[PDB]
Amino acid sequence: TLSILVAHDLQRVIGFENQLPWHLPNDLKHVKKLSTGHTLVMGRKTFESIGKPLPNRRNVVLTSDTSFNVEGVDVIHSIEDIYQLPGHVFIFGGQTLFEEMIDKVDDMYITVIEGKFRGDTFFPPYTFEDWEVASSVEGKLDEKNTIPHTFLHLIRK
């Protein structure tokens, strides 16, 4: 299984200056619930913006840098290498990897942040014409999580 995993706002912003534009503890909980024991694939800039591998899953970084080595992180050098990875693989980031991967994934897991943020990095455009809503669950607003967000699981038609 090859899925996308992504949080994006109303205009499809996903990043700003190496950050998530927003602070949403619920979404980070959802990510580690979904991907624990699985594989996260990410471009070099996504990885460099986090800074360490994420515990209790495989962290695969895609780069053309042959010197690139980080403890706890496997390295691949072509989009093609992705398809040789055993298990449930989630495309995790970023703009440029989603651009490469969106036409190929079986499956998309999207948190829609119902806000409009300043951003520099975007998720690709997509129509529900091609994707069917497996599920749509509103996140709960509270003290810590103060932006409306919706979990969508979209499956290619």
Ligand SMILES: NC(=O)C1=CN([C@@H]2O[C@H](COP(=O)(O)OP(=O)(O)OC[C@H]3O[C@@H](n4cnc5c(N)ncnc54)[C@H](OP(=O)(O)O)[C@@H]3O)[C@@H](O)[C@H]2O)C=CC1
């Ligand atoms: N809110 C969210 O859900 C998420 C936010 N983000 C954001 O994304 C931002 C990064 O922007 P973006 O440019 O998209 O970066 P990416 O994370 O997609 O990394 C891009 C790099 O990945 C490598 N790469 C991509 N495709 C290939 C390929 N086909 N062959 C070899 N190497 C490849 C290259 O690395 P190299 O140049 O070293 O050769 C490329 O420069 C981050 O700052 C982060 O905030 C990302 C994902 C999710």
Ligand SMILES: COc1cc(-c2cc(C)cc(C)c2)cc([C@@H](C)C#Cc2c(C)nc(N)nc2N)c1
């Ligand atoms: C800039 O700093 C970053 C930190 C993290 C991060 C760090 C830790 C310690 C834990 C977790 C769960 C995420 C992730 C990212 C980027 C790569 C992301 C993401 C992403 C999100 C947040 N939500 C959904 N749904 N999908 C996604 N692909 C950037």
